[PDB]
Amino acid sequence: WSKLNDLFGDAALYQSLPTLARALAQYLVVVSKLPSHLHLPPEKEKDIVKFVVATLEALSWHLIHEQIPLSLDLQAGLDCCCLALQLPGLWSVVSSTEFVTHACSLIHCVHFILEAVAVQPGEQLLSNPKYITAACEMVAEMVESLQSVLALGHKRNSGVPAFLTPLLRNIIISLARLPLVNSYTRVPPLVWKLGWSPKPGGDFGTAFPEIPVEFLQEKEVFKEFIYRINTLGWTSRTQFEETWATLLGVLRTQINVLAVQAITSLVLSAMTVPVAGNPAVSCLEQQPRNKPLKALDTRFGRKLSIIRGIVEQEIQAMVSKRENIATHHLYQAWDPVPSLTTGALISHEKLLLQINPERELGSMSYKLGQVSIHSVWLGNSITPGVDIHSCSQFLLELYSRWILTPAILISEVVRSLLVVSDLFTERNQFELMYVTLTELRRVHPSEDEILAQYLVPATCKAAAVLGMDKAVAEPVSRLLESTLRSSHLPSRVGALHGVLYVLECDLLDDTAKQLIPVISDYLLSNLKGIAHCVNIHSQQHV
Amino acid sequence: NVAEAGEQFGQLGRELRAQECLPYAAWCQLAVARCQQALFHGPGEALALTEAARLFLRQERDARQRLVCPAAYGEPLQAAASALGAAVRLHLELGQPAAAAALCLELAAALRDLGQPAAAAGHFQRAAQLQLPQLPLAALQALGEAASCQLLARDYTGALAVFTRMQRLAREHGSALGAFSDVLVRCEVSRVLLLLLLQPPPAKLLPEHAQTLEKYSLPEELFLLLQSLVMATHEKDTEAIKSLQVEMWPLLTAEQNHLLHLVLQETI
Amino acid sequence: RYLVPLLQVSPSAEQLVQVYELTLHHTQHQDHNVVTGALELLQQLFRTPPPELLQTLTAVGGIGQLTARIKGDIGQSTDDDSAPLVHCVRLLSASFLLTGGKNVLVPDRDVRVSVKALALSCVGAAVALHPESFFSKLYKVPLDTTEYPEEQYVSDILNYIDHGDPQVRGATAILCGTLICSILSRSRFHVGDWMGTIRTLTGNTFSLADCIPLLRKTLKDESSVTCKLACTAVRNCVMSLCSSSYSELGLQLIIDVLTLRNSSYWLVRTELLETLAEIDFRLVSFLEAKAENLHRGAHHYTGLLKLQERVLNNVVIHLLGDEDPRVRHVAAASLIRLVPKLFYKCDQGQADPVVAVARDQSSVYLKRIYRGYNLLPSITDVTMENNLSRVIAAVSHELITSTTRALTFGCCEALCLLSTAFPVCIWSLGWHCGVPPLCTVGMATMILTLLSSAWFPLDLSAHQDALILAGNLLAASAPKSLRVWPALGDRALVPMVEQLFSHLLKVINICAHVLDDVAPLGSFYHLPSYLRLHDVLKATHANYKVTLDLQNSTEKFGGFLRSALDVLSQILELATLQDIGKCVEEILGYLKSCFSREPMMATVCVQQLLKTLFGTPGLYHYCFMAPYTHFTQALADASLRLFEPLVIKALKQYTTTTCVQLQKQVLDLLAQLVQLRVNYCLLDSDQVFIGFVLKQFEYIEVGQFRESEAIIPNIFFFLVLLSYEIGIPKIIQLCDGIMASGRKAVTHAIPALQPIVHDLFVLGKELETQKEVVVSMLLRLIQYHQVLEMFILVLQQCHKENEDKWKRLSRQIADIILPMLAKQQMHIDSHEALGVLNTLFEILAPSSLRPVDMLLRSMFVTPNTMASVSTVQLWISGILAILRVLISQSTEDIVLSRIQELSFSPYLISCTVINRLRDG
């Protein structure tokens, strides 16, 4: 450290490191939309991995000595670091055997900027050589904070100045996906108090095996393992089938409830349109059920597309929610609608008015309309790296023998089957879904209104991929009329998504489309009451 | 009978919380409230509807906080704000608008936790107008949590509307006392960091915004560094603005530390 | 062990030193039941010492003037050149817990760890008495340098932090607490100069830099019994460091207790908050501004180290929301102890944190309507109204924005203990939030919505504290609003009073149907909300009538019936005859059933109804310039009948009761039936009640009466007021018995005349003879400073009645008190006592003070002996109060012409004369 204060610690050399730090922030973003002349070179790829390490160590060196760096220079130096962990090129170099010192020094220096700001003096965050396991213990503490400390708007989040809770939430995820670290982070903290400590070996520090099933048989021990796997994602495809076998041996009813919900979240990280297993970079694919327009593509019509490109783009800088976007940059317009046998990604300016009105601007989550039945029929040609086809046949056998179980487990099994419905890939697979749900209603009582509002979304998305035929219309049309008369206001909302898929694509039967004036009459009554006041009644029912 | 029907549904809801299901003990609490509309129990009818509000917001700290599920999508977030719709309407008919605004500050402290900071802005202003006749210092702490929403929701122009309403009551009620003396320190350090962030034109610059910017172009440490920052952005001085964030970082809190970060970028 | 708590012919000073040598022989007499018996006796005689024994041990010679496993010359407790408490620490160590050769533990096999636990708590209670013992050598004559290489001091007592169990590492956690408490108070925070004198005398190297990291560690210990004993060590130790030169290390121990706020042992959390109630957070805010590395500390934090908002929002208000009924009650009493000690930034008084500490130490060293409300102009501190309005801001916020049952429930208990120490009527600008926007109605609109819910009254532990606090917030509007309910005069305030008076007649309606087993305006039948309140007052009344225990303060029905007759009283003052005229039928039926359970405050409900049925600044200001000018301004002024069933029942109780809280509220109910002229028909034929008051004077003089103190001011108000209709000849013969033949004066004889003198001097030939009698009795009693307030009343009537008679009487008490002030018979021991005597020489006539022959022979005197601070303290109060006369009442010219004639030599109290008195 004698050389590090004279060749590096100069106050003239320090000034460059936030001027060279805005430089690499804007260059790594456009990589997802540049041609191949403009990508970063493979020989100059090593020297951009080594320079994320060196500008984040000038940030920790002022907090010891002088003051904060500039706190815009807190913000320009941690944007060079959030993007090298999202690219497929720059992330692979940090994982290798040559960079054990450079991946364990971004853990000491992002725990030093998060502790010297959030942790007031006399606290903590929440309530082999030595440095590797001092880097391994460092990542376990930070992920339990995303519940409490770095959650946007918590009572504990009055201390972080809220331009880093976008920046420091995306960067604790992508460091525990390193193979230096990832094996320890999935172990929940109630295990290390108990007697589990095998030896690690992977030609690295910590290469622990996965947790055996016998520890997961306690609920407080089982609620903390499911947290480590969703916000962390997974890695190369060998590690995806490791978490699959641990949950099925769990399949006392307090642990039967919470592990049918853990199988929902593993399929959706095979449903993601980029890297598919990384909640750092990416989010769930959604499909527009609105077709592309006809009013464009003329000589006056090509002029229409340039003008409203400028208006919509600075809305999302003001109006929208940045669920996708960590950094502070302006033109981050990114919609994960794929093409479709999937293909490339469609940019935001090309899908100008495709996105359905059910969704807040840019907020990417599940909202019952991810895969529209337009996109079922042209990826799977049926019209009336993981083997994702493999995991969906095994789940049809399990949830039918439980239906055909306590009333707590009746409600949460119908809900796990509607989510995976994005991933059914065969006309053999959609036919088995509709059969199990109709034998329930005649047997299970009609007045179970938790169970009533998951199955009206479930029974209606089957008959859309299926033919909406005369033997299928009379069971599907009668069930939508009754639940709209129900007094349960979140039961009113699930039944209205089932109207759409029937109304969406199939040329509907002529007698059943005279029961669109059953659904046409409900819409007139509840707008005249929610014309003046919308603050009173609801938000996601309105 | 109908009196005896309500006592049977109460024994069922408590043996389920130790069984820890909680959409179904949450469905057990909405059955107690449907009986007391057949009879007329009044303020006890609103006690069955707000214990069903505590149980749909615990199903979603196990779906978006403890067990962060991408398949969690707000069926018990739609269920939480609908049992609280019938609760606020039944205090007003009996005529207690101070108890109607206690139940709407519970609905908006979840939506800031579940990551919906624009509709959290929202329900904080509903519970103030039910308190401005009654408690004008319980009403000014519901508008200080409304300025922490819109800066997460990035509503920097709607954030100037809610800061000039906090300061117009303390000159009617406080002149300052105390509890009202700390509400006015937070509102003349944060209306100055917004008018340099977004610098309004003289048409949409009110006669209340006109008064505070003549004084600059509250503690004696922090009053001196805020007259100096309105000068630099009118002089476009890149060396003046950089040495003040270094020397105003311990002074502010981290809600006021967010508004000073977005000025130094939009002038540099 | 039971009698030494009571020792604080008398038990002699040589009788108590025979007790003490008896035990040191018995800490050595071998047993395990006899060694443990004399070690609980020694831990308690240092904590509560008898004051005769306490001076013989701290003294240098000590026992030598009263007479005129261990293997070395300790030196017994007869030797001179060392205190006996220097001797008593050498003896209890080498026998129990230390070996004289090396820093080494003694094994638990030899001495039990029940016996090693009581020996660490006796070495700590003596350092608070004589702190020079802990730095001494273990053996006086050194022990055999052939066998042992080095000799050690008594600092190996502080190596028992690593020893095994709790209560040894926890009782060396408390041995470092009172070693730091009692060096700072011994040498007056001079840790620099006092440590130099010891090191050349006993050569140990033991600073206080090597004990606070031994005390920082036991706070982080594992066992929850080890953590209870280390946080009482910071109750003694962080008020002495933080104002000392080691206040770098003193602030760090404030920081670490804050991490101890969330440990799950309920005795660990309540001895935290007592060491966060005794903090002076105006002295604590001063050290933050001086720190630059301490704000960083560990891990190089950036920002301010905000102790005050973190110790007030995240402990004290936070520990109100705890699950235990034990933890919620102790956190309220700290917000009674925190509000005078806050220092929030930039008040319009104290500006700096330098100027903040200077105003709490200058007040120290430089100087009938109901109980709820006030009508004065209410002079108040401007900056003490600002600290009380920030503690009622964060407390009404965890009561409205709270999501738990436990936050709403134990924060209505923290608002009822503010209003009984910081009342709302006096501090209304702190309580004010909104309502009437200007004498305030603060925050009372939320709490009525708590009571009208059908959830919150169903538990009597905190429904009785929400009724005493809703009557304090509707009574502070009484100095403003008063000019249905026609006397309220503010229609935004009437629904708050319509509700509680509807709420307090339905809770005396459920206490009437419970004390009498009767099946269920004020009516709770048709409400289903108050049929839930009938099953909760019937669970607490089946445990009283079945379990006999009379002396309980907390009963939760006997505690709950006390709360809802106190606040039915305070509202009737706002009421009139027209509002109550349809309810005098109602409230009198309930009290006949509500009389037997609690009659002490069921006549306080009856005392008030009859009123309203019959109508009725920058550190130069603070330290000098503001107290210097209250001095010179008081010197220029020194140059100048439905009651008839209920009333008969209350008289049968006074003859047969014994609790003297009930005997005091019945002598005020009868002084109101004579002013409001109810004819003397309470005793229609006989004189039954007036014969019984004469017999009670027999039990006070002899002393056969238990609590005569709290009844003797109110016995004598009833008697003088009847004679305007027992006559004033007979009234003054009873008071002469108590004084000369009876107990002492400051409880019986001096409160006996405060009813007489105010009702005889203030309010023909028969009245002249009785005024000569009362002035002769006080001359026997001038010695007491409460008798000198009664005599400022006497001198102000003679200046109004007859100015020839005014100058005769100020000469008679001129030559009595000035012979007393030279022989120090005048009890001026209080600062309540010097304030009464200086308003006397203003009002005493200046003709009696015009010769300066008398004031100087009473001035220049020497007391008998100035050995004792009982006798040093009354000689310097005779010189300060006759010197307020030689400055105002007579100028400089008159005073010094006299001392040329009176040979008052300046060798009066000289350095040869002052030395022989302190010893003599």
PDB file of N, CA and C in Angstrom, chain A residues 62-68 112 115-123 127 156, chain C residues 255-256 258-259 261-262 294-302 304-306 310:
ATOM      1  N   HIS A  62     -11.846   7.426   0.434  1.00  0.00           N
ATOM      2  CA  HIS A  62     -12.169   8.766   0.906  1.00  0.00           C
ATOM      3  C   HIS A  62     -13.034   8.733   2.158  1.00  0.00           C
ATOM      4  N   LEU A  63     -13.868   7.702   2.309  1.00  0.00           N
ATOM      5  CA  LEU A  63     -14.729   7.579   3.476  1.00  0.00           C
ATOM      6  C   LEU A  63     -13.929   7.360   4.749  1.00  0.00           C
ATOM      7  N   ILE A  64     -12.757   6.749   4.626  1.00  0.00           N
ATOM      8  CA  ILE A  64     -11.856   6.572   5.752  1.00  0.00           C
ATOM      9  C   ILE A  64     -11.229   7.904   6.128  1.00  0.00           C
ATOM     10  N   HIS A  65     -10.762   8.642   5.126  1.00  0.00           N
ATOM     11  CA  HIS A  65      -9.927   9.812   5.339  1.00  0.00           C
ATOM     12  C   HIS A  65     -10.697  11.128   5.310  1.00  0.00           C
ATOM     13  N   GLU A  66     -11.274  11.486   4.164  1.00  0.00           N
ATOM     14  CA  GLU A  66     -11.659  12.886   3.944  1.00  0.00           C
ATOM     15  C   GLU A  66     -13.130  13.168   4.249  1.00  0.00           C
ATOM     16  N   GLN A  67     -14.026  12.694   3.391  1.00  0.00           N
ATOM     17  CA  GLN A  67     -15.483  12.845   3.499  1.00  0.00           C
ATOM     18  C   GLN A  67     -16.126  11.787   2.614  1.00  0.00           C
ATOM     19  N   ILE A  68     -17.395  11.996   2.271  1.00  0.00           N
ATOM     20  CA  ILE A  68     -18.002  11.328   1.122  1.00  0.00           C
ATOM     21  C   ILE A  68     -17.243  11.729  -0.140  1.00  0.00           C
ATOM     22  N   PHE A 112     -18.661  -1.995   2.198  1.00  0.00           N
ATOM     23  CA  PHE A 112     -18.112  -0.876   2.954  1.00  0.00           C
ATOM     24  C   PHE A 112     -18.850   0.415   2.642  1.00  0.00           C
ATOM     25  N   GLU A 115     -22.405  -0.155   4.426  1.00  0.00           N
ATOM     26  CA  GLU A 115     -22.380  -0.089   5.884  1.00  0.00           C
ATOM     27  C   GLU A 115     -22.012   1.300   6.386  1.00  0.00           C
ATOM     28  N   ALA A 116     -21.181   2.038   5.649  1.00  0.00           N
ATOM     29  CA  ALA A 116     -20.807   3.376   6.096  1.00  0.00           C
ATOM     30  C   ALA A 116     -21.858   4.420   5.753  1.00  0.00           C
ATOM     31  N   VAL A 117     -23.012   4.010   5.234  1.00  0.00           N
ATOM     32  CA  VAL A 117     -24.114   4.914   4.939  1.00  0.00           C
ATOM     33  C   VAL A 117     -25.383   4.504   5.677  1.00  0.00           C
ATOM     34  N   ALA A 118     -25.732   3.220   5.622  1.00  0.00           N
ATOM     35  CA  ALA A 118     -26.969   2.762   6.245  1.00  0.00           C
ATOM     36  C   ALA A 118     -26.799   2.441   7.720  1.00  0.00           C
ATOM     37  N   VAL A 119     -25.677   1.839   8.097  1.00  0.00           N
ATOM     38  CA  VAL A 119     -25.458   1.382   9.461  1.00  0.00           C
ATOM     39  C   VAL A 119     -24.892   2.554  10.251  1.00  0.00           C
ATOM     40  N   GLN A 120     -25.738   3.166  11.072  1.00  0.00           N
ATOM     41  CA  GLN A 120     -25.305   4.200  11.995  1.00  0.00           C
ATOM     42  C   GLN A 120     -24.354   3.600  13.036  1.00  0.00           C
ATOM     43  N   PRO A 121     -23.443   4.403  13.609  1.00  0.00           N
ATOM     44  CA  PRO A 121     -22.378   3.836  14.457  1.00  0.00           C
ATOM     45  C   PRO A 121     -22.928   3.200  15.720  1.00  0.00           C
ATOM     46  N   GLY A 122     -22.582   1.935  15.917  1.00  0.00           N
ATOM     47  CA  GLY A 122     -23.181   1.157  16.972  1.00  0.00           C
ATOM     48  C   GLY A 122     -24.417   0.411  16.545  1.00  0.00           C
ATOM     49  N   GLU A 123     -24.442  -0.104  15.321  1.00  0.00           N
ATOM     50  CA  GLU A 123     -25.499  -0.989  14.859  1.00  0.00           C
ATOM     51  C   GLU A 123     -24.886  -2.042  13.951  1.00  0.00           C
ATOM     52  N   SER A 127     -31.468  -6.696  12.135  1.00  0.00           N
ATOM     53  CA  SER A 127     -31.643  -7.275  13.464  1.00  0.00           C
ATOM     54  C   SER A 127     -32.978  -8.001  13.571  1.00  0.00           C
ATOM     55  N   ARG A 156     -37.168   0.974   7.575  1.00  0.00           N
ATOM     56  CA  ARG A 156     -35.729   0.861   7.760  1.00  0.00           C
ATOM     57  C   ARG A 156     -34.974   1.569   6.637  1.00  0.00           C
TER      58      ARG A 156
ATOM     59  N   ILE C 255     -23.508   4.403  23.551  1.00  0.00           N
ATOM     60  CA  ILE C 255     -23.810   3.806  22.250  1.00  0.00           C
ATOM     61  C   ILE C 255     -24.134   2.316  22.380  1.00  0.00           C
ATOM     62  N   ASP C 256     -23.427   1.590  23.251  1.00  0.00           N
ATOM     63  CA  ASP C 256     -23.544   0.130  23.240  1.00  0.00           C
ATOM     64  C   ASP C 256     -24.808  -0.391  23.918  1.00  0.00           C
ATOM     65  N   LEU C 258     -27.648   0.885  23.547  1.00  0.00           N
ATOM     66  CA  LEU C 258     -28.654   0.998  22.500  1.00  0.00           C
ATOM     67  C   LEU C 258     -28.776  -0.280  21.671  1.00  0.00           C
ATOM     68  N   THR C 259     -27.733  -1.116  21.640  1.00  0.00           N
ATOM     69  CA  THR C 259     -27.833  -2.405  20.957  1.00  0.00           C
ATOM     70  C   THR C 259     -28.462  -3.457  21.851  1.00  0.00           C
ATOM     71  N   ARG C 261     -31.272  -3.158  23.338  1.00  0.00           N
ATOM     72  CA  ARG C 261     -32.697  -2.866  23.427  1.00  0.00           C
ATOM     73  C   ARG C 261     -33.582  -3.999  22.942  1.00  0.00           C
ATOM     74  N   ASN C 262     -33.035  -4.990  22.252  1.00  0.00           N
ATOM     75  CA  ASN C 262     -33.845  -6.062  21.692  1.00  0.00           C
ATOM     76  C   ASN C 262     -33.352  -7.432  22.133  1.00  0.00           C
ATOM     77  N   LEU C 294     -15.259  10.228  16.366  1.00  0.00           N
ATOM     78  CA  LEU C 294     -16.244   9.407  17.058  1.00  0.00           C
ATOM     79  C   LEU C 294     -17.518   9.271  16.233  1.00  0.00           C
ATOM     80  N   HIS C 295     -17.833  10.284  15.411  1.00  0.00           N
ATOM     81  CA  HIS C 295     -18.909  10.155  14.425  1.00  0.00           C
ATOM     82  C   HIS C 295     -18.618   9.033  13.441  1.00  0.00           C
ATOM     83  N   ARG C 296     -17.355   8.892  13.040  1.00  0.00           N
ATOM     84  CA  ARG C 296     -16.960   7.755  12.224  1.00  0.00           C
ATOM     85  C   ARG C 296     -16.942   6.479  13.054  1.00  0.00           C
ATOM     86  N   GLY C 297     -16.063   6.422  14.052  1.00  0.00           N
ATOM     87  CA  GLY C 297     -15.950   5.260  14.907  1.00  0.00           C
ATOM     88  C   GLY C 297     -15.387   4.059  14.177  1.00  0.00           C
ATOM     89  N   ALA C 298     -16.045   2.926  14.392  1.00  0.00           N
ATOM     90  CA  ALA C 298     -15.779   1.750  13.579  1.00  0.00           C
ATOM     91  C   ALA C 298     -16.351   1.955  12.184  1.00  0.00           C
ATOM     92  N   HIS C 299     -15.783   1.233  11.211  1.00  0.00           N
ATOM     93  CA  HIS C 299     -16.164   1.140   9.793  1.00  0.00           C
ATOM     94  C   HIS C 299     -16.322   2.462   9.039  1.00  0.00           C
ATOM     95  N   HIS C 300     -15.859   3.575   9.625  1.00  0.00           N
ATOM     96  CA  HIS C 300     -15.742   4.888   8.975  1.00  0.00           C
ATOM     97  C   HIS C 300     -17.062   5.389   8.392  1.00  0.00           C
ATOM     98  N   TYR C 301     -18.057   5.541   9.263  1.00  0.00           N
ATOM     99  CA  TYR C 301     -19.369   6.034   8.870  1.00  0.00           C
ATOM    100  C   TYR C 301     -19.300   7.502   8.475  1.00  0.00           C
ATOM    101  N   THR C 302     -20.197   7.914   7.584  1.00  0.00           N
ATOM    102  CA  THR C 302     -20.349   9.318   7.225  1.00  0.00           C
ATOM    103  C   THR C 302     -21.745   9.791   7.620  1.00  0.00           C
ATOM    104  N   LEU C 304     -24.015  12.258  10.801  1.00  0.00           N
ATOM    105  CA  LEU C 304     -24.019  12.637  12.201  1.00  0.00           C
ATOM    106  C   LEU C 304     -24.409  11.456  13.080  1.00  0.00           C
ATOM    107  N   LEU C 305     -23.851  11.449  14.286  1.00  0.00           N
ATOM    108  CA  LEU C 305     -24.136  10.442  15.295  1.00  0.00           C
ATOM    109  C   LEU C 305     -25.280  10.972  16.138  1.00  0.00           C
ATOM    110  N   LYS C 306     -26.504  10.756  15.671  1.00  0.00           N
ATOM    111  CA  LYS C 306     -27.693  11.329  16.298  1.00  0.00           C
ATOM    112  C   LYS C 306     -28.102  10.424  17.449  1.00  0.00           C
ATOM    113  N   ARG C 310     -32.380   8.887  18.115  1.00  0.00           N
ATOM    114  CA  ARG C 310     -32.312   7.432  18.080  1.00  0.00           C
ATOM    115  C   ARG C 310     -32.623   6.802  19.429  1.00  0.00           C
TER     116      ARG C 310
END
